[PDB]
Amino acid sequence: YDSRSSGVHDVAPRDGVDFMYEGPQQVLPGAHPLPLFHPDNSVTRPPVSPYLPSPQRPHPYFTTELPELPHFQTTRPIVYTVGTMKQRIVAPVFDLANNVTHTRELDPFIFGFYPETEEMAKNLSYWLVRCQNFSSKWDYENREIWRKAKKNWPNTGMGMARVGDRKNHAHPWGAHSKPVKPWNLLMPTMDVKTWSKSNRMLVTLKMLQGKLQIVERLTLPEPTQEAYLQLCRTMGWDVRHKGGGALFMDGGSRLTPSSEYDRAFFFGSFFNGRNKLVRPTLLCDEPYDYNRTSSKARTKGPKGQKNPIPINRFNAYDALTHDTLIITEGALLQLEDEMYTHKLAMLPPHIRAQLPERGFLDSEVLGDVPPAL
Amino acid sequence: EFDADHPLPVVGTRLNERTTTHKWSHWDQYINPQITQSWMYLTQTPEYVGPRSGHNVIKMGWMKIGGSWKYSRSYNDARRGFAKGQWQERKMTPRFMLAPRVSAGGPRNRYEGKASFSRLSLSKLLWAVDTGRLNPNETITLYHLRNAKVIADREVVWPGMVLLAGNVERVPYPLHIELQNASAKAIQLLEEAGGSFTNVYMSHEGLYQELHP
Amino acid sequence: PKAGCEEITRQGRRVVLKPQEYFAQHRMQVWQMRFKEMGPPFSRVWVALGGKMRRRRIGRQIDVKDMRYYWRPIEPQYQRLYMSRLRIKDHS
C-alpha cells in the first residue's frame, strides 16, 4: 500500500472538464456529507411521490385524504400488526394519460411494513443464490478422466517422482478429488413465512423511498413495442438501460383484476431496456424436497428445495436495481386478498377475538355479506 | 487546545489515516431508509462474520491458512473423520461392552403396538380454549386440536395423545374431550367441573379417519 | 482442450449423486439395549447397569453383589465419546 508515490498523476489540467476549487461556497458536483455509492438527486432518478421523502414526513405520501379527489378505501378492512407503520397511507393512482385520478389508500400490512435490512437480506441472499446457472458449475472429477489406471513404471530404485496414475488434480491433465458438481450445490429452502416478510419490507421500502407508483391500467393501445415506449414517455418512466428502470406488477384494472398479464402489455413489455414484468404476488408455496436424503440417485439438480421461486416473482434483487415500482390496482386487490388471512392469523388472540365485532370476518360463504371482488 | 489560537495539528496516525468507507449498518438503514440504494447495501446478519477462514486445528487455537503445520499432526487426522464401522474405544473394554444387556429389546424400546403417547399438557388445552382456538361447546376431539394448530403433524403418532394435568389445579368451565388415555388426575379435574372424558382408543385405521374425514 | 486436452475428449465414467446413509445410523443397538439416556434438557446421563451382575456370584462380597443393581451414570468421559457419533448430524 501507499506504493507508487509518483507518476500516477499528470501535472496538468485536462483543458476541458478539469477545474480548480474556487471556494467554500463552490457547490461541487457529486459532493455530499453522506457516504453514498449511488449519488442520485431528484432530477436523475426523480421520485414519483407527492412529497420528497423527508425525515419529518413518516412517508412521502398523502398521510390524509385530500379533499379534491375521490378516495377509495382499501379492498379489505385494515389492521396494524407487529411491524406495520401505525400511520395511514394514501397513494394517488395515475391515469394512463399521466393525469392523477382518484387517490387510493394502501394496506398498512403490505405497504406499511417498516424495513429492517437483515430481513430483506434473507431475501437477497436467496436470490443471489437461486439465480445462479447451477448446471454450469460442473467440473471434471478424478475418476472421470480416462487415463491409464496402471503405473507404467513401478518406482523402485531411481529418482523418479513418487507418482503413478497421474489422473489426479495435481497435473495439468487431471481433475479434482472433491470437485464441484451441480448435485452438490445447495439451492436454499425459502419459507413463505419469510418470503412474504422479505417482500413486504421491500415494497414498503420502495414506498418509503418514494419510488412507488400506482397505475389504473397497464394496458397499451396496441401490442407493438413502440406503443409501450410511447406509454413510458407520457408516464415518464426511464426504461433505458442506464436510467433506472421500472418494475411492473401487472394486475389489471381496478374492477377487472387479473393475474395473467394483459396480453396487450405483455407483448409490448418486450423492450431491450431495463424493465421486468413480475407476477402480482408476494407469497409462494411451501418448499419441498422430494429427493430429501438421496432417493433419486440420477437427478442433475441442486441440493435443497426442488421448488425454487421462479425468476419473475417479486424478489429483492430486481427490486433494488429497478428504481420505480409500477403496480396496478388489480394487483393491490390480489395482494390484500392473498395476505388477508395471513394478516389476521398473526394478530394476538385478545385482538383476533374482536374482529367479527368490527367487521373483519364477514364470510361470504355463510352469506353474511355479498361476495367481495 | 489550551488556547484556541494554537490549534493542535492534524498529523494523522494509524488509527485515522488507515480507515475505510463507512458501509451502512443495519441501524443507519433503520433510521433513514433513504440510503439503502442498491443490493450491495443488504449485507448479511451482523452475526455472520463471513465464511470460515482458518484451520481450527485442535490443541492449537485457530490457525491461519498458509500457517505452520508443525502442530496440525492431529488436524490432518481429525479431518479424515471418525473411524466408520469401528469401535470408538481402541483399548480399555468399551464402556458399552462392560455394562450388561438388559431387556432384550432395550430399556425403552418401542415394539409394534406399544402404548406410548405424546403428552398434551392440560395447560395447553386449557390455554387454547380461552384463547379461542378451540370451541368449548363442541366435544374437542383430536381433529379440532390438529386443525386449529394446537398440535401439529409431528406430535400425533399412534395412538393419539395423553391428557396430563400439568400444574392445572383447577378447570373452570364444563369441558368435554374425546382424547386417548387421560391421566387419572386430568380425568378427575374435568369430571369435577361437570365435564366428560370418554377416552377413545382407536386403532390406527381409526386414527386416520378421525384426522382426515 | 484445457483440463487435459485429450483426457477430456475421450470419455470415461461420469459420476452422479452419491446416496446417503441411514440418517439414524449412529444410534446403534449396543446402546439401544445397554444404556438408556435420562435427564432434563442440558443434562443427559446415560445410566448403565452394574458390571458384574451375571458371571460370578458365589463368594463375592455380600454388600458389593448389589452395587451391580443400580442405574449408575457412565462417567462423562464416555458420555461424550458415544454422544459424539450423534452430534455429527448437522455440524457447524
Partner: peptide, 6 residues
C-alpha cells in the same frame, strides 16, 4: 432408498 453401504 439404496443406503450408502460404507
Amino acid at each position: 432408498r439404496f443406503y450408502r453401504p460404507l
